[PDB]
Every structure is written in structure tokens, then in C-alpha cells.
Amino acid sequence: KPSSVAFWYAEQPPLAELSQFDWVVLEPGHADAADIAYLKAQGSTPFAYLSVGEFDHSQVMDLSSSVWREHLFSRAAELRRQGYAGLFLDTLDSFQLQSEDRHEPQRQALVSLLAELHRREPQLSLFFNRGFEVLPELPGVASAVAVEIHAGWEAASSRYRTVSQEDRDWLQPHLEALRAQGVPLVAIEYLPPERREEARELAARLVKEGFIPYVTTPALDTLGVGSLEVQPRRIALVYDPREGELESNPGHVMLGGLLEYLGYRVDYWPALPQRPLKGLYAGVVIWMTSGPPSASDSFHAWLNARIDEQVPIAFLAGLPVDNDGLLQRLGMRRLPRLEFHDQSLLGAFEAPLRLRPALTVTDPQLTQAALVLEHGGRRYVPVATGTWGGIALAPYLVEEALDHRRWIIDPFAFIQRAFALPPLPSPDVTTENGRRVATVHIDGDGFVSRAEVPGTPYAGQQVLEAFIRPYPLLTSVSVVEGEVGPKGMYPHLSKELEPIARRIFADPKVEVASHTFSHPFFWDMRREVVGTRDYINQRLTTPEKPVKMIFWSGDALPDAETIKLAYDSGLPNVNGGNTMLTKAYPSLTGLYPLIRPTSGGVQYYAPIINERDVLDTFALTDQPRRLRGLHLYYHFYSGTKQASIRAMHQIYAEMLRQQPLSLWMSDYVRRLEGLHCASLARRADGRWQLRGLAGLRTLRLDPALGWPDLARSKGVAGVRDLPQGRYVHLSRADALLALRSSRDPRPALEEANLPLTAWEYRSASQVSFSFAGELPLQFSVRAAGPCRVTVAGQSFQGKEHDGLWRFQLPMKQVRDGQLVC
């Protein structure tokens, strides 16, 4: 029996958010096979809309007609074959539009139609929309019945209308009876997107009245409020393609990574979506500096639609608005000495405020200036916020110089203020089981180069002996077929080079990746993606250790079709961007995003760029905010010179001093997948519900939300309260996070060196747990009394240090260990 239900009849269903709901009704034809399978993998049950009484300007069909009956029976079979778990049966009372003479005939034809559909397809759950005239003769057939109770939509007048008490009285006996037969009742209510607080109240009311509510819009094209409410965890970033493609837009390059860090999926848009963003987007960033698009009327309409639904909008850098009425709605108008500024928003973050846009505030009730400059006696306002969002216009956004930029606004404070962002458990990929994450991946370039060392071995052997073998970090290694293979550019060296590659790929700390055939410096694509995959799999490694990833060469900006080709070939991908921060130039403007979404799929940028700059980037992305894990990225050419070799050894040493949790790049990318896809929802019992996390298992909990409540959580193992964040550790993707205002004194995981695969409280003092990785397990527990772990008939007493109980077990995996304190 369902605990929550959502309806989405539009294209581009937001899959992770909808998967928060037990049942999801879709419009088949606006959804594809991949959509259905994703919902199911997340635990949701997908239903398909099917109109029974009418054909779609509708045609009331003859329910006794053999052509129509068999059409619907056929459609049911197809939809089942396509993966739907049920049907949402609509227009079940449309027969009453006929003459009273034909009413009983058609009713009886409908009872038999539905009985026969049920008989033929017993595996399909049948979710009726009303049907009160036929349900009494279909006992046990309906899994649920919907009713469109308090807030309705009147299609004839195109308006939202309170439901008459007369209408409820008519419904009341029918619903009473259904409740007595144990049939779930789904109340489908309609409120405009801006009246979201009312929707929350109505949903709570309908639950107490015994319904499963879903409060939405008449087009069913919004993420509505149900018995749970999805937390808007996306931010949109709109750019002007005339000014450049996404990958060079300054908002993507300088802000995308900060929005990811703050806790959000970032969707990038150059036709803008013509549906409500309310309930799905926490805000919209606009970063356009050449004015409105040529289709300016539609653009202005779109902006006004967000204002009207109260989705906040932040205009950064430029103000692409040629519409005084729009500006008037925001209390602004088009029209140097410093008259005023809000130092919480600018001037105290990186760059100081230095004097160097014809825009002012007309209504301080609507817009609060953060910066007021006076020139020629007029007051200009280039930075401001209000309930509608904000503006932060050049040259008071970023200080710019050739090769260097610094923030003038505090970007975090501005976005938080403009969008009124609430505190979140933010998905976080920098830290796992309380430890900073470490990856090491190697581009194959220079494998064939000879090291400037005695013996002049190949760079491939040098990296194997100097770096891979001596250090205990899992490493993801690529080669270029154009270097090492018979069909490449060194066909007579392949006989000496392939054996080295085979030895590397056979090391137990190594996983295999491809670095293409010809190492394109600037992106035959099937030859580069598929052919070198096949070359490596066949000649350099075994069936049990295949290529796991493609590492892009060169500028690492393939097109959408190439990315899709890589996915179609079983190869997740990594590289690109230019995340680099140095003590010389430590501005956070140097942080790229992790994620580059395309129509061909997601490209993951290199978390930290390749080849002192790197040791600095590690430190500046660790503190005061931990923006990145320890991500060592280099080329085989780095093993050709004593000085590069010396530098490498110093990087490895700093990484190991931090005692990270080591991951292969292919496993790390499943964490980044969660970064991109995660959804958060707030249940009525107050717990946070998670979907779409994939391999991600850390939430950075905003201290305003308190501490994990380990009595009421599911899949939450502990917390580590560090300067950079309150890291909550998850033992599964479908976790439920209960919160309390004080730290839970029951035994909690503090840190561990291996991935965590289970953690369940048997009691306030006993935990069953499981870990699996590549090193002997080390972990520590925060608890009062002494702690002991029993595994496979053996007991280990915890060693105490400063409130923690530390454990070192001589095993790389633990299945259902027992912790008692």
C-alpha cells in the first residue's frame, strides 16, 4: 500500500526527486524506458496514465465497443511490457455525459471492460480515478482510488477554486465505503505554485483526514507537495550562447563549483523550460553580459514567470533586461564616491572595494542596496537583494586582471541571501567516513619517453617502480595506444612497451583506463573511444580486469556525441577544467566545477589539475572550506626527470600524512554521480530522505540542523565534527536522516579507512556493521564506555584516545561485525 504518490505528465521528469515518492504516475509518451528503469531502481513504482472513457477536444468512446475495448486491452499489455507496474485509469465517469437511457448500458460495459483488463493483466496494479459507479461491482480490483477534496481546479473558468461543501457531501459516502474496504484514497488537489505554504498545510490536513495528498498544478508539470515534500536541491544557471559556449562561460567556470560545494545540483540552460520551477529549483542564476536574447519578449516573459511563482533570480555580472516594467516590479530603474555598503555581502571576502552601471533603486521596500555609489549627484546601486533575488553587476562582482580574478562580493553570502537558502545536509564528495578522499590517476602521455636517470628506462617502468609499487594508494592508470601498440607511432617499441603496461595493470593497486589512440590535443571518435578500449582489453589486461574508464586527452572538451559514445561503450569519463589555487594566487575563482553536463551525458572534470602549485591547491581546498579531496593527477612524463620525480615524492608524502581514504577513480566517479543526481526530501516524521546518491555516502550537515539522531535514523553510522564541516557518514544510498539538537551519545562511527557497507543499531549499545576495501580495516568510535568489536568468533578491545575507541582489524572486509559499548 502506498505511503506517497506523485503525478508528472510533462516531459523531462525529474527522476531522483520523483523517486522520493512510493508511486509515480507518468504520461507514457512523455517518458522513456530509461526513466521507468531508474524509478524502479530507486524503489518507486511507476504507473502509466490511461484514459478509459475518452479518446484525445475529447471523444466519449463506446465502452461496449469491441474496437475500443481491445484497443485498451492492447495498450495495457504494451505498457506492462515496457516496464510499468500499474495503470492510472482516467475518464471513468465520462459515460454519464450520454443520455440517461444509455447510462446503465455503458456503466455495465465499463464494469466488464475493467474486470477483463484485470483478468488479462493481473500483474498491473489498477489505480482508479474515481469510478464510484463501477467499483461496487469490482471488489478487490482497485489498488487505490484518486479523487480530484479542498482545493480544486475548474477547467471551464481556468481557475483555482475552493471545493464546495456540496461537492464534498456527495463524495463522502463513496469515500467512507472505500475506506471500509481498506482501499487507499489519494486526494489530488490544485494550488498555484506560489501558494506553496498553503499547500503544505493542506497536505497535513488531508493526511489527518485519512488521505494520501498530492497538491499540484492543473498541467501536472510541477513537483508537488505530498505526504512528503521534496527539498528543492537544484540551481539553474542561464547563459547567453552568443557570448560563448557553456564551458567558457564565467558563471560555469567560477561559480558552478561553489554551488556544487554549497549543496546543489546545477542545471545549465542557454529554449528555457516552460513549466514552474517552484518545488524543484531553489533559484536561478543569470550570467549574461550582452543584453537580452534576440527573442527578448519570450525571455522577459520567462523571467516574469519566475518572479510571479517566487523562484528567486540572481543577475550576476550583467543585467540582460530591456523592460522598464520588469525593473519596476523589482523596485529598480535605469538612470564615483562611496556612500554605503553591506560588508556582509562584499568588500571583506577577497578583493577590497575599489571605485572604478546606470541602475538605481526606486523602492527600498522591494530591493535593499548592498552598495550605493554616487556620481554626478545621482545614487547608483550595482549590488542588491530582495525577496525576488538579487543583482551583483560588474565591476563590483569580480576584480579582473590578465590571468587573475578575485571575488569582490562574498559569493556564498550573496547566493544564500538572494535565494534565502535554507540549511541542508549537503551531499559532499571530499570526505568519506570522516577522512579526506584520495585519488591518483595517470594519463598515458610520455609512457614511451626515456627517463633522464641512470639506465634510461622507459617512463612506464619508472612510474611503476618509483610511485605505484612503493605507496599504498589505489591508482587508476591509462595508456595511449598510439604510444604502446603495434598500430601506433612506435610499432617497433611495442614489444618492449606492452610488457611494461601489462605489469602495471596487473599490480593489485591499479585499475585500467584508456587514454585514447592519438591523444587529440583539441577535441575518428569510434577509433579513439572504442578501438583503444578493445586494444587494451585484448592485449594488455585480462577479462577480469578490463578498462574501467576513459581519460580525455588535451583540452578534454569532447562534444556531447563523443561523451555519449563513451557511455555507450561502458566507459565513464574524467578530465578537463583547470582547478588550481596557489599561495601566490589563492582566490576561490580558481576553482572549476566538478560536473560538466551535456545532452550526451555527464563529463566529470579533473577535480584538481595536473602538472608546488599542487601542494598549494590541496591546502587551499582543505581550509577553511574543504572544496576538494586529495586528487593527484599526472602524466608518465613526470617520471622522466629527477626534479619532477623529486616533486612527485613530496606530493605523495603530504597525501599520506593526511591519512586519507583511498579510492580508485572509477569508484570516485560514482560519488560524483551522486553529487550531480542526489535529491533530498522532508518527511512528515521530520526525517530527511535520500535518493539518487549512487556511490556518495557523506552529507555535510549544516550546524543549524543539529546532529544525527542515531536512535531514529536508518543507514546513518556517525559524524565527525571538523573545522571544515559536520560530516555525517552513510552506510547506504537510501538513508533516512533523523536529527536532534545535541550530539547523540550512543556509539557512533568517527572515522574509518575503508568504505562502509552496513551499520545497524540493534540497541543503544550494540551495532552490526560491515566494511569492504583494499587495506586492513582501521576505524574509531565515539562512545562513553569501553568498546569491543567481535568479528568471526574473535574479539578486539578498543584502545582509548580522547573520547574515541580505536580499532585495527587484520582483515580487508568485515561482514556483520558486532560493536558493543
Residue numbers in the entry: 27 to 82, 106 to 197, 199 to 320, 324 to 388, 396 to 416, 421 to 587, 615 to 702, 717 to 926
Task: Reproduce text from the manuscript describing this model.
A major biofilm matrix determinant of Pseudomonas aeruginosa is the partially deacetylated α-1,4 linked N-acetylgalactosamine polymer, Pel. Once in the periplasm, the large 948-residue protein PelA modifies Pel using its two enzymatic domains. PelA's deacetylase domain selectively removes acetyl groups from the polysaccharide, rendering Pel cationic, while its glycoside hydrolase (GH) family 166 (GH166) domain hydrolyzes Pel. The hydrolase activity is required for the generation of the cell-free form of the polysaccharide, which is important for the biomechanical properties of the biofilm and P. aeruginosa virulence.
Herein, we present the crystal structure of PelA from Pseudomonas thermotolerans (PtPelA) and show that the protein has a unique four-domain structure. Diffraction data were collected for selenomethionyl-incorporated (SeMet) PtPelA at the National Synchrotron Light Source-II to 2.1 Å, and the structure was solved using the single-wavelength anomalous diffraction method. Structural analysis of PtPelA reveals four distinct domains that align well with the AF2 model of PaPelA (PaPelAAF2; 1.6 Å RMSD over 816 α-carbons). Upon analysis of the PtPelA structure, we found that residues 293 to 498 form a mixed α/β domain with 12 β-strands. In our crystal structure, we were unable to model residues 588 to 614 and 703 to 719. Modeling of these residues by AF2 in PaPelAAF2 suggests that these unstructured loops are important for forming a 23 Å-deep, 44 Å-long binding groove. PtPelA also contains a 14-stranded β-rich region comprised of two distinct regions (residues 793–937). Combined, this suggests that the β-rich domain could provide structural stability to PtPelA and facilitate carbohydrate binding. When submitting the structure of PtPelA to the DALI server, only structures of the isolated hydrolase or deacetylase domains of enzymes were identified. These results suggest that the domain organization in the full-length structure of PtPelA is unique with respect to experimentally solved structures. Using sequence analysis and enzymatic assays, we found that PtPelA and its homologs define a new class of carbohydrate esterases, CE21, with distant homology to the CE4 and CE18 families.
